[PDB]
Design an enzyme around this catalytic site. Structure first.
Site, PDB file in Angstrom:
ATOM      1  CG  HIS B 256      63.511 126.516  89.720  1.00 61.44           C
ATOM      2  ND1 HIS B 256      62.902 125.281  89.617  1.00 61.44           N
ATOM      3  CD2 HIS B 256      64.620 126.323  90.471  1.00 61.44           C
ATOM      4  CE1 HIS B 256      63.615 124.379  90.268  1.00 61.44           C
ATOM      5  NE2 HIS B 256      64.676 124.979  90.774  1.00 61.44           N
ATOM      6  CG  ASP B 257      65.977 127.403  93.975  1.00 65.86           C
ATOM      7  OD1 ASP B 257      65.151 126.513  93.649  1.00 65.86           O
ATOM      8  OD2 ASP B 257      67.173 127.136  94.206  1.00 65.86           O
ATOM      9  CD  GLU B 284      65.946 127.751  86.363  1.00 67.32           C
ATOM     10  OE1 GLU B 284      65.001 127.038  86.737  1.00 67.32           O
ATOM     11  OE2 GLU B 284      66.680 128.267  87.173  1.00 67.32           O
ATOM     12  CD  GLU B 316      60.132 125.734  87.621  1.00 64.08           C
ATOM     13  OE1 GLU B 316      60.913 126.071  86.697  1.00 64.08           O
ATOM     14  OE2 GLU B 316      60.536 125.294  88.735  1.00 64.08           O
TER      15      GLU B 316
END
Ligand code: SAH
Ligand code: SAH
Ligand code: EUG
Lengths: 358, 351
Positions: B256-257, B284, B316
């Site tokens: 998600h980064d 996640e 996300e």
């Protein structure tokens, strides 16, 4: 009272609440960026709800390919908090797209008939200048003092005299908010009828003075505030703009109106201003005080939350300010010479009280 | 109804007071003081809390009371009212269920350091450049500082530590629960934690499965801060250049980064790092299908907004988006193995 037995289910809710709290600032900050990009006004004007983020982005000065998805992500956050509404459209091509519309709160986050909303108040409350003191709150509790004065070496009003950007933001924020409240005050409150002169003490750029003079054209009004505020007050017929410091004295008139002034200052600073008011009024003059009133308990209602939020903000920013109960206001009134006390009206959580020397 | 709309707008405008007031209460240790001191019936006065603070400020109790009143209105703490002889009421405060996660548990861990991270001055700054990033392109964080967030962490060591302890505390709480449920670590001889931070997850897995040798792989400036744990080897590196070899790769809160292109590049290095039948274990959040008002959805959408303001394109994703990343990176099998505190554990299986 039924006892909740701790379970994995209740631990999960407690964990996710702590996570929500941790990142709660994302809401006002995302909303601030939507307002500065004029996303809600674009929605207000463009909506056939509901509009796609790509159709919003098409009305922005941008060629960034990622604008629509960035807007989508912001609006999805706002939707979860009922600031906007949404509908889902399946893309002929399999994937789900969101379209967005305005929710009922956007009535106050977009310009009304008459060109006014609470959006400039939101830009003020989320300004960089006003977030900074929060990092000195711990220091002020342990070391004494005022977190805002620790941030920049002076009180907030002196700071407005040195930062012209924030001075404008603050004056526009307060003016928008008081406009909305005063319009409803004026509908239900009769205390202005009959007066010849009124003085607005800390009247800011004069929005309230000008509305009172519009409703009552036989009234003469004095908008009294600090010089750096007065310098920017628009001219308005029937309104005299005067610069000074209210703790040194206030202009004479038949009544004095103070809105959102008492909560900025300690009881001693209040007593001093109210004596100054007592001395500038005739024998049957009155102070009209428009303020929030602390509720009985910190219950979870939104009306109570708004008053407790503002109490916390007057912990960070201001020289001794706080919210007060109806008894504390009567106390301050009796202590500064007024014999009469009346709760006259209420609009949008702001109560109108009269301190009567009589 | 006009009144309710206006009051909600006023609430939104000053919404940050809550997390900022909370941060100050945590930095003052007010919740820990409460947890240790609250007598059997369960409420304590702000005067009694203040007496335990390193302060001589006569105003401290009153200012504590005012912060706690805000927290109580949001059910962060509980309260009772005690009438005074002279009519006015005093507030006494106690611990609400969320306080379990905002004070040290028996393993000495809480989410408080995650809240200190989320409310840090460094991380508020990018929000003032979100408008700019939306109009001009780029990332609000980069606009504010010279550079991407992880490069910044290698320049500002105070924030590096806050962030690493934030992530460590959060991942500890979540991993303890996952380890009680997830059986995917058995038969493994070696596991690689890619972007494993200061090594908390890697250490938990070896504590549970001392047969496993764990590599904890992260950027040099994070590895620098990683305490020694037996069975964990710390290794500094750049995952987009290559990932260490192991039987499985564990990536928590890494995808998600990063944008899809960056994730694909990462997952292909992962595929390359694994034996024929190895797997990547991905932990996640999963984006829910609508902006619903549940706290669990809000947490995921908040993190999506945070990725937008901090990271090199993170976001996300839905479970079908993760299935697409697995597929586009050559994985043939996909499974959702368990879930703790919104964190799903997915496996991407090579066969
Ligand atoms: N010493 C002083 N003398 C005169 N005005 C003052 C003052 N200290 C603060 N003020 C003014 O008090 C105001 C507080 S904000 C409230 C503004 C306005 N009455 C309203 O309700 O919208 C600011 O405009 C500030 O400039
Ligand atoms: N190129 C790279 N190579 C390896 N690690 C990286 C990286 N870019 C960022 N990271 C690391 O990725 C991590 C993301 S933070 C969350 C990760 C941790 N697995 C946890 O769940 O608690 C950070 O520790 C950051 O230093
Ligand atoms: C953003 C905070 C709102 C606010 C702050 C300081 C003040 O002095 C004020 O009016 C009295 C309002």
């Amino acid at each position: 009272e039924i006892q909740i037995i701790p379970t994995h289910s209740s631990d999960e809710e407690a964990n996710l609440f702590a996570m929500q709290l941790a990142s709660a600032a994302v809401l006002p900050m995302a909303l601030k960026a939507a307002i500065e990009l004029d996303v809600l006004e674009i929605m207000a004007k463009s909506v056939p709800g509901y509009i796609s983020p790509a159709e919003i982005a098409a009305q922005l000065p941008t060629t960034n390919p990622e604008a629509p998805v960035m807007l989508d992500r912001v609006l999805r956050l706002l939707a979860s908090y009922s600031v906007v509404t949404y509908t889902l459209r399946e893309l002929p091509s399999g994937k789900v797209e969101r379209l967005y519309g305005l929710a009922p709160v956007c009535k106050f986050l977009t310009k009304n008939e008459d060109g006014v909303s609470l959006a400039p108040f939101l830009l003020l409350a989320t300004d960089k200048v006003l977030l900074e003191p929060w990092f000195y709150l711990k220091d002020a509790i342990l070391e004494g003092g005022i977190p805002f004065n620790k941030a920049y070496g002076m009180n907030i009003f002196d700071y407005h005299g040195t930062d012209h950007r924030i001075n404008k933001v603050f004056n526009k924020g307060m003016s928008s908010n008081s406009t909305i409240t005063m319009k409803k005050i004026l509908e239900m409150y009769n205390g202005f009828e009959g007066l010849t002169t009124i003085v607005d003490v800390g009247g800011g750029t004069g929005a309230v003075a000008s509305m009172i003079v519009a409703k009552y054209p036989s009234i003469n009004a004095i908008n009294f505030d600090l010089p750096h505020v007065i310098q920017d007050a628009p001219a308005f017929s029937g309104v005299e703009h005067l610069g000074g410091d209210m703790f040194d004295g206030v202009p004479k008139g038949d009544a004095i109106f103070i809105k959102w002034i008492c909560h900025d200052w300690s009881d001693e600073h209040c007593l001093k201003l109210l004596k100054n008011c007592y001395a500038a009024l005739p024998d049957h003059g009155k102070v009209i005080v428009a303020e929030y009133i602390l509720p009985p308990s910190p219950d979870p209602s939104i009306a109570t939350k708004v008053v407790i939020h503002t109490d916390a903000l007057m912990l960070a920013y201001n020289p001794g300010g706080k919210e007060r109960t109806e008894k504390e206001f009567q106390a301050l009134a009796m202590a500064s010479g007024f014999r009469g006390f009346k709760v006259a009206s209420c609009a949008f959580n702001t109560y109108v009280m009269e301190f009567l020397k009589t």
